[PDB]
Design a binder for this molecule. Structure first.
Ligand SMILES: CCCCCCSC[C@H](NC(=O)CC[C@H]([NH3+])C(=O)O)C(=O)NCC(=O)O
Ligand SMILES: CCCCCCSC[C@H](NC(=O)CC[C@H]([NH3+])C(=O)O)C(=O)NCC(=O)O
Lengths: 209, 209
């Protein structure tokens, strides 16, 4: 530490790392970049892939939100107890990222016309996660193993925004509904989710959700 | 071990992990799924995300090409000397994945009409890797640290298929050109790249490259 998140004023790709830091009792500095500032073009050319999030952990500057998430998993001890678990956490986080990729394209490229087709195809995309939970202690623990990982925080965020998009999407997925309820109730996540910083922040930049 | 890769008969998302295994002196089995068998629809429901590659390592079954690569990186000691390196290698590999995703979209959905635009945009996408390399020992070693890692194989594969798509795209990138040349001359990669198995396998599934 110290931790600094540099990002646009939206939840987007930074709300899972914010929830992880909050639930682990860490504090961080939030460096908000407004669109006017981004459009001035001084910040972008200093960013490795010209995009945000940018994260600082003391000495180390990182880019790519999943690299930042895996870094926090590795350094805060949220990456499983052994290689098999870590391999499975990666498979989970990668599946999360694929659906987050589709969600971002719906929101920003085709909200109006794509929405009903997205939501109709959503159960087939949520089913893998329900299968993984049943296979792990009947869905009563975390997505991989007995302890929380970086992957849980990223999956919870993905499910929380899909419930805003399609309110009953978890009605036929009992283990995922219970998982969402369970993890949201964790004292420090529950507190973070009720914080004005989280609440005043839009999910996406274009007003859709 | 044993190692088994279950994939379509194309290079696609499995040629980087094949080069990694070959260079680390491992043997593996290829279970080839043809497109006509896949379209019968019997194997797809058994895949966690309905997709291939599927990888078997002894009794661990994995899906997601980057989870498989990170797994091999972790089990074979190709993930750096410390946490700082490990985070940097993930940042590199997520940057490779972003460009691979763009490449896939070009190839399968918009080749004839998007190629010129892609190639014009490509220098701005390769410049980060050139910069990373110049900061790591003036580009004479690997992408991160002084030992090869899973990210080097994924980056090498990305640049090799881009040299097919846009011959001479590395002309303005002296360090990436020297890098490709250096890693391609590693005797076990050199053997793999001239093997008929590799040579006769198409880069992509739709005849474009
Ligand atoms: C206006 C607020 C809403 C937009 C927020 C969308 S995420 C922002 C976008 N960055 C990314 O898409 C980063 C993707 C990267 N792969 C990651 O995982 O971190 C960006 O920096 N875009 C700036 C650019 O490309 O110029
Ligand atoms: C189609 C013939 C040529 C395709 C070669 C490209 S890989 C095929 C595609 N798989 C993927 O896109 C996997 C992406 C996944 N994120 C990964 O990294 O493993 C698939 O299984 N597609 C089958 C499906 O979706 O039904």
């Amino acid at each position: 530490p110290p931790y600094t998140i540099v990002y646009f004023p939206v939840r987007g790709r930074c709300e899972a790392m914010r929830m992880l830091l909050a639930d682990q009792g860490q504090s961080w500095k939030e460096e908000v970049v407004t669109i006017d500032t981004w459009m001035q073009g001084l910040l972008k050319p200093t960013c490795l892939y010209g995009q945000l999030p940018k994260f600082e952990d003391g000495d180390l500057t990182l880019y790519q939100s999943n690299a930042i998430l895996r870094h926090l998993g590795r350094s805060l001890g949220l990456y499983g107890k052994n290689q098999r678990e870590a391999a499975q956490m990666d498979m989970v986080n990668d599946g999360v990222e694929d659906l987050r990729g589709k969600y971002v394209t719906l929101i920003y490229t085709n909200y109006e016309n794509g929405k009903n087709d997205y939501v109709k195809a959503l159960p087939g995309h949520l089913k893998p996660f329900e299968t993984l939970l049943s296979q792990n202690q009947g869905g009563k623990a975390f997505i991989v193993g007995d302890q929380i990982s970086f992957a849980d925080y990223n999956l919870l965020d993905l499910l929380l925004i899909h419930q805003v998009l399609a309110p009953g999407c978890l009605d036929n997925f009992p283990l995922l509904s219970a998982y969402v309820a369970r993890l949201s109730a964790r004292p420090k996540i529950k507190a973070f989710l009720s914080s004005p910083e989280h609440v005043n922040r839009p999910i996406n930049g274009n007003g859709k959700q």
